């Protein structure tokens, strides 16, 4: 669960200014969940889908 920093990076949080809603890999649950991404200040490892996120992070390990 740490092949590369692409399985780490930042999540920021995702309050939302315009809200896009993408996924991010939350390393408190070690799984991909969603977040508004904010839009204007989304400083995180954005993932379009969790199946994409899980692919690299969760399944490539």
Domains of the chain, residue spans: 1-61
Kindly report the backbone phi and psi dihedral angles of residue 25, in degrees, each rounded to the nearest multiple of 5, phi listed first: -85, 105
Method by which this entry was solved: NMR
Distances (CA, A) of 48 to 23, 42: 6, 13
CA distance 52 to 55: 5
Q: CB–CB of 42/12 below 8 Å?
A: yes
Pick the closest to residue 45 from 59, 29, 56 (CA basis).
56
SS3 17: coil
* Domain 1-61, architecture per CATH: Irregular (4.10)
């Amino acid at each position: 669960p740490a092949q590369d920093y692409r399985c780490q990076l930042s999540r920021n949080y995702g309050k939302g200014s315009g809200s896009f809603t993408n996924y991010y890999y939350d390393k408190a649950t070690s799984s991909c969940k969603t977040f508004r991404y904010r839009g204007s200040g989304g400083n995180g490892n954005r993932f379009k889908t969790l199946e994409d996120c899980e692919a690299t992070c969760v399944t490539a390990e």
